[PDB]
Protein backbone atom coordinates (compact mmCIF):
# COMPACT_ATOMS: atom_id res chain seq x y z
CA UNK A 1 0.00 0.00 0.00
CA UNK A 2 1.63 3.21 -1.24
CA UNK A 3 -1.46 5.44 -0.99
CA UNK A 4 -1.17 7.70 2.10
CA UNK A 5 -3.85 7.42 4.76
CA UNK A 6 -6.40 10.09 3.82
CA UNK A 7 -8.89 11.50 6.34
CA UNK A 8 -10.94 14.67 6.68
CA UNK A 9 -9.84 17.43 9.06
CA UNK A 10 -10.92 20.99 9.88
CA UNK A 11 -8.50 23.88 10.42
CA UNK A 12 -9.17 26.91 12.64
CA UNK A 13 -7.00 30.02 12.62
CA UNK A 14 -7.14 33.81 12.54
CA UNK A 15 -5.18 35.86 10.01
CA UNK A 16 -3.74 38.52 12.32
CA UNK A 17 -2.51 41.35 10.09
CA UNK A 18 -1.09 44.61 11.49
CA UNK A 19 0.17 47.12 8.92
CA UNK A 20 2.15 50.34 9.34
CA UNK A 21 1.08 53.17 7.01
CA UNK A 22 2.94 56.42 6.36
CA UNK A 23 0.71 59.33 5.34
CA UNK A 24 2.55 61.86 3.20
CA UNK A 25 1.49 65.26 1.96
CA UNK A 26 -0.21 63.74 -1.11
CA UNK A 27 0.26 59.96 -0.87
CA UNK A 28 0.04 56.90 1.38
CA UNK A 29 2.60 54.12 1.72
CA UNK A 30 2.95 50.83 3.61
CA UNK A 31 6.01 51.08 5.85
CA UNK A 32 5.54 47.46 6.96
CA UNK A 33 3.00 44.63 7.13
CA UNK A 34 3.12 41.75 9.63
CA UNK A 35 0.94 38.73 8.80
CA UNK A 36 0.53 35.89 11.29
CA UNK A 37 -1.82 32.91 11.63
CA UNK A 38 -3.10 32.90 15.21
CA UNK A 39 -4.58 29.59 16.45
CA UNK A 40 -8.07 29.37 17.93
CA UNK A 41 -8.31 28.00 21.50
CA UNK A 42 -10.38 24.94 22.38
CA UNK A 43 -12.84 27.08 24.34
CA UNK A 44 -13.58 29.20 21.27
CA UNK A 45 -13.67 26.24 18.87
CA UNK A 46 -16.24 24.49 21.09
CA UNK A 47 -18.27 27.20 22.88
CA UNK A 48 -18.18 29.81 20.06
CA UNK A 49 -17.55 28.30 16.60
CA UNK A 50 -19.16 24.88 17.02
CA UNK A 51 -21.75 25.95 19.59
CA UNK A 52 -22.83 29.24 17.95
CA UNK A 53 -20.92 29.62 14.68
CA UNK A 54 -19.10 32.81 15.72
CA UNK A 55 -15.49 33.84 16.34
CA UNK A 56 -14.11 36.27 18.88
CA UNK A 57 -12.96 39.56 17.36
CA UNK A 58 -9.62 39.21 19.21
CA UNK A 59 -6.68 36.83 18.79
CA UNK A 60 -4.97 35.76 22.03
CA UNK A 61 -2.05 33.37 21.54
CA UNK A 62 1.62 32.76 22.28
CA UNK A 63 4.23 33.89 19.76
CA UNK A 64 7.98 33.95 20.40
CA UNK A 65 7.30 33.28 24.11
CA UNK A 66 4.95 36.29 24.50
CA UNK A 67 1.21 36.43 25.21
CA UNK A 68 0.19 38.64 22.30
CA UNK A 69 -3.40 39.93 22.03
CA UNK A 70 -4.63 41.38 18.73
CA UNK A 71 -7.92 43.27 18.41
CA UNK A 72 -9.81 43.61 15.14
CA UNK A 73 -9.87 47.30 14.16
CA UNK A 74 -8.61 48.01 17.71
CA UNK A 75 -12.22 47.63 18.87
CA UNK A 76 -13.57 45.80 21.90
CA UNK A 77 -14.19 42.06 21.79
CA UNK A 78 -17.31 41.18 19.78
CA UNK A 79 -18.85 38.00 18.40
CA UNK A 80 -18.44 37.93 14.61
CA UNK A 81 -20.73 35.75 12.52
CA UNK A 82 -18.98 33.31 10.19
CA UNK A 83 -19.91 33.41 6.51
CA UNK A 84 -18.86 31.28 3.52
CA UNK A 85 -15.75 32.27 1.61
CA UNK A 86 -15.69 33.35 -2.02
CA UNK A 87 -16.31 30.62 -4.56
CA UNK A 88 -13.23 28.91 -6.00
CA UNK A 89 -12.97 26.00 -8.42
CA UNK A 90 -11.71 22.73 -6.94
CA UNK A 91 -11.59 23.87 -3.31
CA UNK A 92 -13.10 22.55 -0.09
CA UNK A 93 -15.62 24.47 1.98
CA UNK A 94 -14.30 27.42 3.97
CA UNK A 95 -15.69 30.26 6.06
CA UNK A 96 -14.39 33.57 7.37
CA UNK A 97 -15.61 36.50 9.46
CA UNK A 98 -13.86 39.48 7.82
CA UNK A 99 -13.18 40.38 4.18
CA UNK A 100 -11.88 43.97 4.07
CA UNK A 101 -8.47 44.63 5.59
CA UNK A 102 -8.34 47.50 8.09
CA UNK A 103 -5.83 50.36 8.01
CA UNK A 104 -5.56 53.48 10.18
CA UNK A 105 -7.28 56.77 9.24
CA UNK A 106 -5.15 59.35 7.29
CA UNK A 107 -3.23 61.79 9.60
CA UNK A 108 -0.43 63.92 7.98
CA UNK A 109 3.33 63.19 8.54
CA UNK A 110 2.56 60.38 11.04
CA UNK A 111 3.00 56.60 11.21
CA UNK A 112 -0.06 54.59 12.37
CA UNK A 113 -0.68 50.91 13.09
CA UNK A 114 -3.93 49.18 12.13
CA UNK A 115 -4.60 45.61 13.28
CA UNK A 116 -6.87 43.17 11.43
CA UNK A 117 -8.07 39.84 12.85
CA UNK A 118 -10.01 37.62 10.42
CA UNK A 119 -11.19 34.32 11.90
CA UNK A 120 -10.88 31.55 9.32
CA UNK A 121 -12.13 27.96 9.43
CA UNK A 122 -11.56 25.49 6.59
CA UNK A 123 -12.14 21.84 5.78
CA UNK A 124 -8.86 20.30 4.59
CA UNK A 125 -7.91 16.82 3.45
CA UNK A 126 -5.25 15.36 5.75
CA UNK A 127 -2.74 12.77 4.55
CA UNK A 128 -0.39 10.44 6.41
CA UNK A 129 2.08 7.66 5.60
CA UNK A 130 3.66 4.79 7.50
CA UNK A 131 4.46 4.68 10.46
CA UNK A 132 1.56 7.20 10.57
CA UNK A 133 3.30 9.16 13.34
CA UNK A 134 2.48 12.52 11.69
CA UNK A 135 0.18 13.97 9.04
CA UNK A 136 0.04 16.92 6.66
CA UNK A 137 -2.86 19.15 5.63
CA UNK A 138 -4.11 20.41 2.28
CA UNK A 139 -2.43 23.76 3.03
CA UNK A 140 1.01 22.12 3.21
CA UNK A 141 1.32 22.48 6.99
CA UNK A 142 2.83 19.55 8.89
CA UNK A 143 1.27 18.23 12.10
CA UNK A 144 3.72 16.24 14.23
CA UNK A 145 1.13 14.03 15.91
CA UNK A 146 -0.23 10.64 14.98
CA UNK A 147 -3.76 10.90 13.50
CA UNK A 148 -4.88 8.15 15.90
CA UNK A 149 -3.42 9.74 19.05
CA UNK A 150 -5.86 9.91 21.94
CA UNK A 151 -6.59 9.04 25.54
CA UNK A 152 -8.82 6.02 24.83
CA UNK A 153 -7.96 2.32 24.32
CA UNK A 154 -4.17 2.62 24.28
CA UNK A 155 -4.11 5.56 21.87
CA UNK A 156 -1.87 7.44 24.33
CA UNK A 157 1.09 5.31 23.17
CA UNK A 158 1.10 6.99 19.74
CA UNK A 159 3.76 9.50 18.75
CA UNK A 160 3.33 13.14 19.78
CA UNK A 161 5.67 16.14 19.72
CA UNK A 162 3.46 18.79 21.36
CA UNK A 163 2.83 19.30 25.06
CA UNK A 164 -0.05 17.62 26.87
CA UNK A 165 -1.98 20.88 27.27
CA UNK A 166 -1.88 21.44 23.48
CA UNK A 167 -4.13 18.42 22.77
CA UNK A 168 -7.79 17.90 23.71
CA UNK A 169 -10.22 15.06 23.01
CA UNK A 170 -14.00 15.49 23.24
CA UNK A 171 -16.45 12.58 23.30
CA UNK A 172 -19.97 12.77 21.94
CA UNK A 173 -19.08 15.78 19.81
CA UNK A 174 -21.90 16.93 17.50
CA UNK A 175 -20.32 18.79 14.58
CA UNK A 176 -22.15 22.01 13.69
CA UNK A 177 -22.49 22.55 9.92
CA UNK A 178 -21.82 26.30 9.48
CA UNK A 179 -23.26 26.42 5.92
CA UNK A 180 -26.59 24.62 6.41
CA UNK A 181 -26.68 25.61 10.10
CA UNK A 182 -27.34 21.94 11.02
CA UNK A 183 -26.15 19.58 13.81
CA UNK A 184 -24.81 16.07 12.98
CA UNK A 185 -27.12 13.35 14.38
CA UNK A 186 -24.07 11.14 15.07
CA UNK A 187 -22.01 11.85 18.23
CA UNK A 188 -18.37 11.69 17.10
CA UNK A 189 -15.08 11.49 18.96
CA UNK A 190 -13.40 14.79 18.05
CA UNK A 191 -9.68 15.39 18.55
CA UNK A 192 -8.26 18.90 18.89
CA UNK A 193 -4.66 20.10 18.67
CA UNK A 194 -3.50 23.71 19.06
CA UNK A 195 -0.41 24.07 16.88
CA UNK A 196 1.73 27.24 17.12
CA UNK A 197 0.09 28.62 13.95
CA UNK A 198 -3.33 26.91 13.73
CA UNK A 199 -5.82 24.57 15.39
CA UNK A 200 -6.80 21.32 13.64
CA UNK A 201 -9.81 19.14 14.48
CA UNK A 202 -10.36 15.64 13.11
CA UNK B 1 -1.74 14.06 -23.72
CA UNK B 2 -0.16 14.52 -20.29
CA UNK B 3 2.25 17.32 -21.24
CA UNK B 4 0.90 20.67 -19.93
CA UNK B 5 0.16 23.40 -22.45
CA UNK B 6 3.37 25.45 -22.58
CA UNK B 7 3.43 29.04 -23.86
CA UNK B 8 5.69 32.06 -23.43
CA UNK B 9 4.68 34.91 -21.11
CA UNK B 10 6.28 38.08 -19.74
CA UNK B 11 6.02 39.22 -16.12
CA UNK B 12 6.15 42.84 -14.95
CA UNK B 13 6.52 43.83 -11.31
CA UNK B 14 8.42 46.16 -8.98
CA UNK B 15 10.24 44.91 -5.89
CA UNK B 16 9.07 47.49 -3.36
CA UNK B 17 11.40 47.22 -0.36
CA UNK B 18 11.19 49.57 2.64
CA UNK B 19 13.60 48.86 5.49
CA UNK B 20 13.81 50.29 9.01
CA UNK B 21 17.36 50.89 10.27
CA UNK B 22 18.41 51.68 13.83
CA UNK B 23 21.63 53.69 14.11
CA UNK B 24 23.45 53.04 17.37
CA UNK B 25 26.47 54.73 18.88
CA UNK B 26 28.85 52.43 16.97
CA UNK B 27 26.68 50.08 14.88
CA UNK B 28 23.73 49.82 12.50
CA UNK B 29 20.90 47.28 12.64
CA UNK B 30 17.82 46.40 10.59
CA UNK B 31 14.77 46.79 12.82
CA UNK B 32 12.51 45.52 10.02
CA UNK B 33 12.33 44.95 6.26
CA UNK B 34 9.11 44.82 4.23
CA UNK B 35 9.40 43.32 0.73
CA UNK B 36 6.46 43.43 -1.68
CA UNK B 37 6.00 42.80 -5.41
CA UNK B 38 4.02 45.73 -6.79
CA UNK B 39 2.32 45.15 -10.17
CA UNK B 40 2.88 47.46 -13.14
CA UNK B 41 -0.25 49.13 -14.61
CA UNK B 42 -1.27 48.70 -18.23
CA UNK B 43 -0.48 52.35 -18.96
CA UNK B 44 3.12 51.89 -17.81
CA UNK B 45 3.54 48.49 -19.51
CA UNK B 46 2.39 49.98 -22.83
CA UNK B 47 3.36 53.68 -22.85
CA UNK B 48 6.59 53.34 -20.79
CA UNK B 49 8.10 49.83 -20.88
CA UNK B 50 7.00 48.68 -24.34
CA UNK B 51 6.92 52.14 -25.92
CA UNK B 52 10.19 53.50 -24.46
CA UNK B 53 11.80 50.73 -22.38
CA UNK B 54 11.61 52.64 -19.08
CA UNK B 55 9.84 52.20 -15.75
CA UNK B 56 8.42 54.82 -13.44
CA UNK B 57 10.49 55.34 -10.29
CA UNK B 58 7.30 54.99 -8.17
CA UNK B 59 5.03 52.03 -7.41
CA UNK B 60 1.31 52.85 -7.16
CA UNK B 61 -0.90 49.86 -6.41
CA UNK B 62 -3.56 48.46 -4.10
CA UNK B 63 -2.50 46.38 -1.10
CA UNK B 64 -4.82 45.30 1.72
CA UNK B 65 -7.49 47.66 0.35
CA UNK B 66 -5.21 50.74 0.45
CA UNK B 67 -3.80 52.85 -2.40
CA UNK B 68 -0.12 52.67 -1.43
CA UNK B 69 2.46 54.76 -3.30
CA UNK B 70 6.17 53.93 -2.94
CA UNK B 71 8.93 56.23 -4.20
CA UNK B 72 12.42 55.02 -5.05
CA UNK B 73 14.88 56.64 -2.62
CA UNK B 74 11.99 58.95 -1.61
CA UNK B 75 12.77 60.99 -4.74
CA UNK B 76 10.38 62.47 -7.28
CA UNK B 77 9.03 60.36 -10.13
CA UNK B 78 11.64 59.76 -12.83
CA UNK B 79 11.95 57.52 -15.88
CA UNK B 80 14.48 54.75 -15.18
CA UNK B 81 16.14 52.95 -18.08
CA UNK B 82 15.82 49.17 -18.04
CA UNK B 83 19.02 47.13 -18.26
CA UNK B 84 19.69 43.38 -18.49
CA UNK B 85 19.99 41.41 -15.27
CA UNK B 86 23.11 39.61 -14.12
CA UNK B 87 24.00 36.47 -16.05
CA UNK B 88 22.71 33.19 -14.64
CA UNK B 89 23.00 29.67 -16.02
CA UNK B 90 19.76 28.14 -17.32
CA UNK B 91 17.58 31.23 -16.91
CA UNK B 92 15.38 33.22 -19.27
CA UNK B 93 16.02 36.84 -20.19
CA UNK B 94 15.28 39.43 -17.53
CA UNK B 95 15.77 43.16 -17.01
CA UNK B 96 15.70 45.53 -14.06
CA UNK B 97 16.15 49.24 -13.36
CA UNK B 98 17.87 49.23 -9.94
CA UNK B 99 20.60 47.05 -8.43
CA UNK B 100 21.70 48.64 -5.13
CA UNK B 101 19.20 48.65 -2.28
CA UNK B 102 18.64 52.04 -0.64
CA UNK B 103 18.78 52.70 3.10
CA UNK B 104 18.51 55.97 5.05
CA UNK B 105 21.59 58.06 5.96
CA UNK B 106 23.14 57.44 9.44
CA UNK B 107 21.63 59.70 12.20
CA UNK B 108 22.41 58.76 15.88
CA UNK B 109 19.78 57.13 18.21
CA UNK B 110 17.03 57.42 15.54
CA UNK B 111 14.93 55.03 13.44
CA UNK B 112 14.67 55.85 9.70
CA UNK B 113 12.74 54.33 6.79
CA UNK B 114 14.26 53.97 3.33
CA UNK B 115 12.10 52.84 0.41
CA UNK B 116 13.45 51.04 -2.67
CA UNK B 117 11.46 50.45 -5.88
CA UNK B 118 13.17 48.25 -8.49
CA UNK B 119 11.15 47.72 -11.66
CA UNK B 120 11.58 44.15 -12.91
CA UNK B 121 10.46 42.54 -16.17
CA UNK B 122 11.10 38.88 -16.98
CA UNK B 123 10.28 36.34 -19.66
CA UNK B 124 8.79 33.25 -18.01
CA UNK B 125 7.52 29.95 -19.39
CA UNK B 126 3.84 29.51 -18.56
CA UNK B 127 2.25 26.08 -18.16
CA UNK B 128 -1.36 24.93 -18.08
CA UNK B 129 -3.31 21.66 -17.88
CA UNK B 130 -6.82 20.53 -18.73
CA UNK B 131 -9.43 22.12 -18.52
CA UNK B 132 -6.89 24.94 -19.14
CA UNK B 133 -8.87 27.29 -16.87
CA UNK B 134 -5.69 28.57 -15.17
CA UNK B 135 -1.93 28.63 -15.69
CA UNK B 136 1.25 28.89 -13.64
CA UNK B 137 4.49 30.76 -14.30
CA UNK B 138 8.15 29.79 -14.06
CA UNK B 139 8.33 31.65 -10.73
CA UNK B 140 5.71 29.35 -9.18
CA UNK B 141 2.96 31.99 -9.15
CA UNK B 142 -0.54 30.85 -10.09
CA UNK B 143 -2.72 32.85 -12.49
CA UNK B 144 -6.43 32.05 -12.13
CA UNK B 145 -7.39 32.90 -15.70
CA UNK B 146 -7.61 30.76 -18.81
CA UNK B 147 -4.64 31.39 -21.15
CA UNK B 148 -7.11 31.78 -24.04
CA UNK B 149 -9.40 34.27 -22.27
CA UNK B 150 -10.22 37.33 -24.34
CA UNK B 151 -12.89 39.52 -25.87
CA UNK B 152 -12.66 38.11 -29.41
CA UNK B 153 -14.44 35.15 -31.06
CA UNK B 154 -16.16 33.75 -27.98
CA UNK B 155 -13.06 33.90 -25.78
CA UNK B 156 -15.11 35.77 -23.16
CA UNK B 157 -16.73 32.46 -22.13
CA UNK B 158 -13.45 31.18 -20.67
CA UNK B 159 -12.89 30.95 -16.93
CA UNK B 160 -11.73 34.05 -15.04
CA UNK B 161 -11.46 34.88 -11.34
CA UNK B 162 -10.32 38.53 -11.51
CA UNK B 163 -12.47 41.59 -12.09
CA UNK B 164 -13.13 42.97 -15.56
CA UNK B 165 -10.94 46.04 -14.99
CA UNK B 166 -7.97 43.78 -14.12
CA UNK B 167 -7.72 42.39 -17.69
CA UNK B 168 -6.82 44.21 -20.91
CA UNK B 169 -6.42 43.01 -24.50
CA UNK B 170 -4.49 44.99 -27.12
CA UNK B 171 -4.67 44.25 -30.85
CA UNK B 172 -1.83 44.91 -33.26
CA UNK B 173 0.69 44.95 -30.41
CA UNK B 174 4.32 45.27 -31.56
CA UNK B 175 6.53 43.79 -28.84
CA UNK B 176 9.60 45.93 -28.07
CA UNK B 177 12.76 43.85 -27.56
CA UNK B 178 14.50 45.57 -24.61
CA UNK B 179 17.86 43.83 -25.24
CA UNK B 180 18.30 44.44 -28.99
CA UNK B 181 16.10 47.56 -28.86
CA UNK B 182 14.06 46.17 -31.81
CA UNK B 183 10.33 46.13 -32.73
CA UNK B 184 8.66 42.85 -33.84
CA UNK B 185 7.32 43.05 -37.44
CA UNK B 186 4.33 40.83 -36.52
CA UNK B 187 1.23 42.31 -34.81
CA UNK B 188 -0.03 40.05 -31.98
CA UNK B 189 -3.14 40.07 -29.78
CA UNK B 190 -1.33 40.81 -26.52
CA UNK B 191 -3.28 39.98 -23.37
CA UNK B 192 -2.61 41.77 -20.08
CA UNK B 193 -3.68 40.87 -16.55
CA UNK B 194 -2.87 42.87 -13.40
CA UNK B 195 -2.65 40.34 -10.58
CA UNK B 196 -2.43 41.56 -6.95
CA UNK B 197 1.36 40.94 -6.96
CA UNK B 198 2.43 41.17 -10.62
CA UNK B 199 1.37 41.88 -14.20
CA UNK B 200 1.63 39.12 -16.83
CA UNK B 201 1.50 39.59 -20.60
CA UNK B 202 1.15 36.75 -23.10
Amino acid sequence: NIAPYKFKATMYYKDVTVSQVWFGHRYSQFMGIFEDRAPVPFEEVIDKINAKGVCRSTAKYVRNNLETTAFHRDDHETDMELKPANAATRTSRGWHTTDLKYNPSRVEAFHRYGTTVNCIVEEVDARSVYPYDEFVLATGDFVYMSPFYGYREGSHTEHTSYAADRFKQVDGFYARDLTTKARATAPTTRNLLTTPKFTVAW
Amino acid sequence: NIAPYKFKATMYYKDVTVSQVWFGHRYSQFMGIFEDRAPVPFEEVIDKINAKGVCRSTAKYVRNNLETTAFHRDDHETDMELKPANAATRTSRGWHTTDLKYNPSRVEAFHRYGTTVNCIVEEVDARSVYPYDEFVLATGDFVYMSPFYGYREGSHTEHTSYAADRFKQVDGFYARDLTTKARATAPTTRNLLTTPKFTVAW
Binding site: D15, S28, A85, N86, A88, T91, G94, H96, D99, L100, K101, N103, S105, R106, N118, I120, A138, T139, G140 | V62, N65, L66, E67, D141, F142, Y144, S161, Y162, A163, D165, R166, P196
Partner: peptide, 18 residues
Protein backbone atom coordinates in the same frame (compact mmCIF):
# COMPACT_ATOMS: atom_id res chain seq x y z
CA UNK C 1 -4.69 26.35 -2.54
CA UNK C 2 -2.26 28.62 -0.69
CA UNK C 3 -2.29 31.25 -3.44
CA UNK C 4 -6.12 31.17 -3.52
CA UNK C 5 -6.25 32.40 0.10
CA UNK C 6 -6.36 36.08 -0.87
CA UNK C 7 -9.05 35.51 -3.52
CA UNK C 8 -11.06 33.27 -1.18
CA UNK C 9 -10.78 35.06 2.19
CA UNK C 10 -10.31 38.72 1.19
CA UNK C 11 -11.43 41.50 -1.13
CA UNK C 12 -8.92 42.32 -3.87
CA UNK C 13 -10.57 45.32 -5.58
CA UNK C 14 -12.22 47.31 -2.76
CA UNK C 15 -10.22 50.39 -1.76
CA UNK C 16 -10.71 52.30 1.51
CA UNK C 17 -9.35 55.82 1.99
CA UNK C 18 -10.05 58.89 4.10
Amino acid sequence: RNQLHDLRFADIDTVIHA
